[PDB]
Amino acid sequence: SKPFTIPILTIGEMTNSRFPVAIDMLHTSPTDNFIVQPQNGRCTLDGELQGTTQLVASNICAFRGSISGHENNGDQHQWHFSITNPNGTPFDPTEDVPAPLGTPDFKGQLYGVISQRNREGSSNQKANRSHEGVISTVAPRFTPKLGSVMIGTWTTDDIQDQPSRFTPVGLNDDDNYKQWELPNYSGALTLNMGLAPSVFPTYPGEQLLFFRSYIPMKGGYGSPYIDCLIPQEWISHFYQESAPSQTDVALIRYVNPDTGRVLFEAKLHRQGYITVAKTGDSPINVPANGYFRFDSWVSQFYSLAPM
Amino acid sequence: KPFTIPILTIGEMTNSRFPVAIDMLHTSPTDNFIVQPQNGRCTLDGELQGTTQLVASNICAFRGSISGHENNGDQHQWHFSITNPNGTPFDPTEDVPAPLGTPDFKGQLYGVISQRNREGSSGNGNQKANRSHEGVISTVAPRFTPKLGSVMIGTWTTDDIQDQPSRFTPVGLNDDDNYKQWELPNYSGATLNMGLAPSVFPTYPGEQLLFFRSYIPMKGGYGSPYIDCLIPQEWISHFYQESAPSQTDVALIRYVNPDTGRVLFEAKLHRQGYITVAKTGDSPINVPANGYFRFDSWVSQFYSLAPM
Ligand SMILES: [Cl-]
């Protein structure tokens, strides 16, 4: 009975739900040779968060917890980062969640800053230190589901056994950055549980539509990007509204609000992703003022106008 | 038409003056401050003000390019030409204080400058070179002139910053020795600020402003700096989208524990986009983590709040 609605925000007014940066563009590409199963940015149209998805954009790809010395290999540039829930409460692995909320959902070298503030003041006047660090999501000691990750720094000294928070910035490099490959949240001992399901276009001629952002790198060559299924602000909206999905597919039109011109139409699936009738890898050129409007509920077999 | 506040706990919301989750509610007298923040400003009917924009991750961020060192300007300082957050050129002639998201406090803003070169490398598959480094943007430096289209950034490196497209991701403060959250920088340098959102203060007897407070990381030094915002970023996004007409100048809001239905306290949400409570003194506000504000009715500035 509660009507379903979509926010009126433009592309530049929204945030990528897989990395804490503004959305740069809409983009579509063939993905049938990938397993498209992101864990951040997952919410059904009726407001059910899935995977590792939480509500605060600034906590996406962030970690909070404390450092407890080095790992077992004795590498003086690597540190054991014990992690909690984003709220500071202890993470409970017995819940069927893949990892603490906001944990990165891709294989790669997550680059950012680790900041510390000591538990006890020097007088208050607590000591602080921050340094650049890299959290490899493919390292054997990347075990967020078990409560810890390994962080590498360029300094082998100035990291203490103190409360710590990691603010993400981008990637260290993109040599092996695989946005559609999930990390092993429990290490080589990984049986990932509680995952949001993979998504895929079933109707002929359709591809997934993504909200794409290009992300910074510490060094190296490349223009890495990350594609989310729906913006963080849509997740916030669906979570609040909890409007029942009347069918499996909401028909949405991307409209120029000045002219009423429809740039294209798309299928917004109840699972929280979009498909369009387009073939090939290309950005979607739209006016900066445009946004999606909900039109009606249709079936999985509705034939969209080609883009 | 009907007015609503999002059902979000404070740990589910973002400070509108720095991109971090809200840690606590706090109230204190402000008679010794001019409370005129420029980020986190939105009226209840959805008018953004000051330097306020909608993307939390763009608060205290800059986008643009590096154009060499500053005049002088040592080898650790660089001229950061800034654009609008969406990449379009910033127009200084608008009655706006500075590019959207510019910091609204005196301090040493610490974070990372990232660069991706304009042209690819023929030897690397026509791919663009990248580099990132820690940097500090002092909002009191003579060359902090964002309204004029540029700020100065200081780095520990002297040799690995190019004249290339650049973005600044904020992390915290370098130190807090001269951090003054209620003192605006000179957006045009040593020239009055323009386009400002109005300053706010309590007026009804026994009332104080209520703040949403977050602690901020530091690069080094001693301290636990915090920043206070008037309303959360998620409330701003909500009011902006709804554009619901404010029926009076004050919405009466109650902070409720949803488990018990108990009202912990009540507050006045003013049309301008800020909250007052009937409390005297610099005090924390002890409330359950699951609590949130609920809109109850439209009242006036004469409404007498129950004390807390
Ligand atoms: Cl200067």
Numbering used by the authors:
A (entry chain B): 224 to 346, 350 to 533
B (entry chain A): 225 to 414, 416 to 533
What did the article's authors report about this structure?
The human norovirus capsid protruding (P) domain binds histo-blood group antigen (HBGA) co-factors for infection, and a recently discovered bat norovirus (GX) was also found to interact with HBGAs. In this study, we determined the P domain structures of four human noroviruses and one bat norovirus using X-ray crystallography to examine structural features linked to potential interspecies transmission. The principal structural difference was a variable length P2 subdomain loop (Loop A), which was located near the HBGA pocket.
The P domains of GII.9 (AY038599), GII.23 (KT290889), GII.27 (MG495077), GVIII (AJ844470), and GX (MF373609) were expressed in E.coli. Fc-NB26 bound to GII.9, GII.23, and GII. P domains in a dose-dependent manner at concentrations less than 80 ng/mL. Structural modeling of the Fc-NB26-binding site indicated that GII.9, GII.23, and GII. P domains contained most of the equivalent residues that could interact with Fc-NB26. Our cumulative data show that Fc-NB26/NB26 binds most GII genotypes, and the epitope is vulnerable and a therapeutic target region for GII noroviruses.
